[PDB]
Design a protein around this nucleic acid. Structure first.
Length: 165
DNA sequence: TATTCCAAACGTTAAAACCTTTAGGAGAAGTAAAACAAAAAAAAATTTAATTAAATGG
Protein backbone atom coordinates (compact mmCIF):
# COMPACT_ATOMS: atom_id res chain seq x y z
CA UNK A 1 0.00 0.00 0.00
CA UNK A 2 2.73 2.51 0.86
CA UNK A 3 4.02 4.64 -2.00
CA UNK A 4 2.65 5.24 -5.49
CA UNK A 5 0.98 2.02 -6.63
CA UNK A 6 -1.25 3.57 -9.33
CA UNK A 7 1.22 2.34 -11.95
CA UNK A 8 -0.40 -1.00 -12.85
CA UNK A 9 -0.59 -2.98 -16.08
CA UNK A 10 -4.33 -2.19 -16.28
CA UNK A 11 -3.72 1.00 -18.26
CA UNK A 12 -7.02 1.16 -20.17
CA UNK A 13 -10.19 3.14 -19.46
CA UNK A 14 -12.80 1.68 -17.16
CA UNK A 15 -14.76 -0.41 -19.71
CA UNK A 16 -11.85 -1.01 -22.08
CA UNK A 17 -9.76 -2.24 -19.16
CA UNK A 18 -12.85 -4.30 -18.28
CA UNK A 19 -12.35 -5.92 -21.71
CA UNK A 20 -8.58 -6.43 -21.80
CA UNK A 21 -5.38 -5.49 -19.98
CA UNK A 22 -1.81 -4.71 -20.96
CA UNK A 23 0.60 -7.59 -21.22
CA UNK A 24 2.50 -7.80 -17.95
CA UNK A 25 4.83 -9.92 -15.83
CA UNK A 26 5.91 -10.25 -12.20
CA UNK A 27 8.72 -7.96 -11.05
CA UNK A 28 10.90 -8.78 -8.06
CA UNK A 29 14.07 -7.29 -6.63
CA UNK A 30 16.41 -9.86 -8.18
CA UNK A 31 15.26 -9.23 -11.75
CA UNK A 32 15.54 -5.54 -10.91
CA UNK A 33 19.23 -6.08 -10.11
CA UNK A 34 19.52 -7.96 -13.40
CA UNK A 35 18.05 -4.91 -15.14
CA UNK A 36 20.35 -2.51 -13.28
CA UNK A 37 23.38 -4.53 -14.35
CA UNK A 38 21.96 -4.66 -17.87
CA UNK A 39 21.43 -0.93 -18.27
CA UNK A 40 24.76 -0.06 -16.67
CA UNK A 41 26.67 -2.39 -18.98
CA UNK A 42 24.76 -0.91 -21.92
CA UNK A 43 26.11 2.46 -20.78
CA UNK A 44 29.58 0.95 -20.53
CA UNK A 45 29.30 -0.46 -24.05
CA UNK A 46 28.18 2.93 -25.36
CA UNK A 47 31.14 4.71 -23.76
CA UNK A 48 33.53 2.11 -25.15
CA UNK A 49 32.03 2.60 -28.61
CA UNK A 50 32.41 6.36 -28.23
CA UNK A 51 36.07 6.36 -27.18
CA UNK A 52 37.02 3.32 -29.30
CA UNK A 53 39.10 3.80 -32.45
CA UNK A 54 38.17 0.17 -33.22
CA UNK A 55 34.93 -1.78 -33.32
CA UNK A 56 33.20 -2.78 -30.07
CA UNK A 57 32.82 -6.59 -30.05
CA UNK A 58 30.71 -6.24 -26.88
CA UNK A 59 27.95 -4.57 -28.95
CA UNK A 60 26.69 -7.44 -31.15
CA UNK A 61 23.41 -9.14 -30.22
CA UNK A 62 23.65 -11.87 -32.87
CA UNK A 63 23.06 -15.55 -32.14
CA UNK A 64 26.33 -17.32 -32.95
CA UNK A 65 28.09 -14.68 -30.86
CA UNK A 66 28.77 -16.19 -27.43
CA UNK A 67 30.23 -14.36 -24.45
CA UNK A 68 32.24 -17.52 -23.84
CA UNK A 69 34.17 -17.30 -27.11
CA UNK A 70 34.70 -13.54 -26.84
CA UNK A 71 36.05 -13.98 -23.31
CA UNK A 72 38.35 -16.72 -24.55
CA UNK A 73 39.53 -14.25 -27.18
CA UNK A 74 40.23 -11.38 -24.78
CA UNK A 75 40.89 -12.95 -21.37
CA UNK A 76 41.46 -11.94 -17.76
CA UNK A 77 42.81 -8.45 -17.14
CA UNK A 78 46.39 -8.37 -15.78
CA UNK A 79 46.17 -6.24 -12.63
CA UNK A 80 42.83 -7.91 -11.79
CA UNK A 81 42.20 -11.25 -13.48
CA UNK A 82 38.53 -11.21 -12.47
CA UNK A 83 38.27 -8.36 -14.99
CA UNK A 84 38.88 -8.55 -18.76
CA UNK A 85 41.83 -7.39 -20.85
CA UNK A 86 40.26 -4.27 -22.33
CA UNK A 87 43.45 -2.39 -21.43
CA UNK A 88 45.01 -3.51 -24.74
CA UNK A 89 42.07 -2.24 -26.84
CA UNK A 90 42.36 0.68 -29.26
CA UNK A 91 40.84 4.03 -28.29
CA UNK A 92 40.86 7.23 -30.29
CA UNK A 93 41.36 8.86 -26.92
CA UNK A 94 44.47 8.00 -24.95
CA UNK A 95 44.16 4.39 -23.71
CA UNK A 96 43.25 4.42 -20.01
CA UNK A 97 44.24 0.75 -19.91
CA UNK A 98 42.84 -1.28 -17.02
CA UNK A 99 40.17 1.37 -16.39
CA UNK A 100 37.89 -0.23 -19.00
CA UNK A 101 38.13 -3.82 -17.68
CA UNK A 102 34.84 -5.12 -16.22
CA UNK A 103 34.55 -8.42 -14.32
CA UNK A 104 34.16 -11.83 -15.94
CA UNK A 105 31.11 -13.68 -14.65
CA UNK A 106 29.28 -10.35 -14.58
CA UNK A 107 29.71 -10.10 -18.35
CA UNK A 108 28.78 -13.77 -18.70
CA UNK A 109 25.46 -13.34 -16.91
CA UNK A 110 24.96 -10.04 -18.76
CA UNK A 111 25.19 -11.82 -22.11
CA UNK A 112 22.92 -14.65 -20.99
CA UNK A 113 20.39 -12.08 -19.78
CA UNK A 114 20.66 -10.28 -23.12
CA UNK A 115 20.05 -13.38 -25.25
CA UNK A 116 16.65 -13.43 -23.54
CA UNK A 117 15.33 -10.98 -26.15
CA UNK A 118 14.79 -13.73 -28.72
CA UNK A 119 11.45 -14.71 -27.13
CA UNK A 120 10.48 -12.30 -24.33
CA UNK A 121 7.22 -14.21 -23.82
CA UNK A 122 9.28 -16.88 -22.06
CA UNK A 123 10.09 -14.05 -19.69
CA UNK A 124 10.86 -16.08 -16.57
CA UNK A 125 13.48 -18.12 -18.44
CA UNK A 126 15.75 -15.08 -18.05
CA UNK A 127 13.75 -12.64 -15.89
CA UNK A 128 16.08 -13.31 -12.97
CA UNK A 129 19.09 -14.72 -14.82
CA UNK A 130 21.85 -12.36 -13.70
CA UNK A 131 21.15 -12.39 -9.95
CA UNK A 132 19.87 -15.98 -9.66
CA UNK A 133 20.75 -18.18 -6.70
CA UNK A 134 20.92 -21.33 -8.81
CA UNK A 135 27.18 -21.22 -1.70
CA UNK A 136 25.59 -19.66 -4.78
CA UNK A 137 24.40 -16.98 -2.35
CA UNK A 138 28.02 -15.95 -1.82
CA UNK A 139 28.80 -16.27 -5.53
CA UNK A 140 26.01 -14.05 -6.82
CA UNK A 141 26.23 -11.50 -4.00
CA UNK A 142 29.97 -11.11 -4.55
CA UNK A 143 29.29 -10.84 -8.27
CA UNK A 144 26.97 -7.94 -7.46
CA UNK A 145 29.74 -6.50 -5.29
CA UNK A 146 32.23 -6.73 -8.16
CA UNK A 147 29.77 -5.15 -10.58
CA UNK A 148 29.03 -2.23 -8.26
CA UNK A 149 32.78 -1.84 -7.71
CA UNK A 150 33.16 -1.43 -11.47
CA UNK A 151 30.24 1.01 -11.44
CA UNK A 152 31.67 3.21 -8.71
CA UNK A 153 35.23 3.17 -10.04
CA UNK A 154 33.95 4.16 -13.48
CA UNK A 155 31.83 6.94 -12.00
CA UNK A 156 34.79 8.30 -10.05
CA UNK A 157 36.99 7.92 -13.14
CA UNK A 158 34.75 10.48 -14.88
CA UNK A 159 33.66 12.52 -11.84
CA UNK A 160 30.16 11.01 -11.96
CA UNK A 161 28.51 10.83 -8.56
CA UNK A 162 27.74 7.29 -7.43
CA UNK A 163 24.20 8.56 -6.75
CA UNK A 164 23.33 8.97 -10.45
CA UNK A 165 22.08 5.36 -10.66
C1' DT B 1 46.86 -29.07 -1.55
C1' DA B 2 44.40 -26.92 -4.01
C1' DT B 3 43.40 -24.24 -8.45
C1' DT B 4 41.69 -23.25 -13.47
C1' DC B 5 39.07 -23.67 -17.19
C1' DC B 6 36.95 -26.67 -20.85
C1' DA B 7 33.77 -30.09 -21.66
C1' DA B 8 29.69 -32.49 -20.52
C1' DA B 9 25.66 -34.74 -18.84
C1' DC B 10 20.37 -33.44 -17.51
C1' DG B 11 15.90 -30.73 -16.62
C1' DT B 12 12.93 -27.97 -17.91
C1' DT B 13 10.26 -24.90 -20.90
C1' DA B 14 8.57 -23.57 -24.85
C1' DA B 15 7.51 -24.73 -30.30
C1' DA B 16 5.96 -27.86 -33.56
C1' DA B 17 3.88 -31.88 -34.92
C1' DC B 18 0.81 -35.07 -34.20
C1' DC B 19 -3.09 -37.69 -32.92
C1' DT B 20 -8.23 -36.78 -31.37
C1' DT B 21 -13.06 -35.55 -31.28
C1' DT B 22 -16.42 -33.70 -33.46
C1' DA B 23 -19.33 -32.04 -37.84
C1' DG B 24 -20.71 -31.82 -42.42
C1' DG B 25 -21.51 -34.20 -46.80
C1' DA B 26 -21.41 -38.53 -49.73
C1' DG B 27 -22.45 -42.57 -51.55
C1' DA B 28 -24.07 -47.56 -50.43
C1' DA B 29 -26.06 -51.73 -49.12
C1' DG B 30 -31.10 -53.47 -47.30
C1' DT B 31 -35.67 -53.15 -46.90
C1' DA B 32 -39.35 -52.37 -49.13
C1' DA B 33 -42.68 -51.29 -51.94
C1' DA B 34 -44.44 -51.50 -56.88
C1' DA B 35 -45.75 -54.32 -59.98
C1' DC B 36 -46.53 -58.88 -62.56
C1' DA B 37 -48.37 -62.83 -63.68
C1' DA B 38 -50.03 -67.89 -62.63
C1' DA B 39 -52.95 -70.87 -59.64
C1' DA B 40 -56.69 -72.15 -56.54
C1' DA B 41 -60.56 -71.41 -54.86
C1' DA B 42 -64.74 -69.35 -54.62
C1' DA B 43 -68.71 -67.75 -56.94
C1' DA B 44 -72.12 -67.56 -60.24
C1' DA B 45 -74.92 -69.27 -63.08
C1' DT B 46 -77.12 -73.49 -65.24
C1' DT B 47 -80.86 -77.49 -65.99
C1' DT B 48 -83.38 -81.64 -64.24
C1' DA B 49 -85.63 -84.01 -61.31
C1' DA B 50 -88.68 -83.76 -57.98
C1' DT B 51 -92.67 -81.44 -55.56
C1' DT B 52 -96.43 -78.98 -55.00
C1' DA B 53 -100.13 -76.09 -56.46
C1' DA B 54 -103.52 -75.95 -58.86
C1' DA B 55 -106.77 -76.77 -62.52
C1' DT B 56 -109.02 -81.28 -64.71
C1' DG B 57 -111.39 -84.98 -63.40
C1' DG B 58 -115.19 -91.36 -61.54
Amino acid sequence: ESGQSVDVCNELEYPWKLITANNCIVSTDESRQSQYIYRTFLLYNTVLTAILKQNNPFDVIAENTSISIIVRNLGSCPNNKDRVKCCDLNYGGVPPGHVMCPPREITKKFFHYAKWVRNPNKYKRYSELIARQSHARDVSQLHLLDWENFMGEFSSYFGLHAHNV
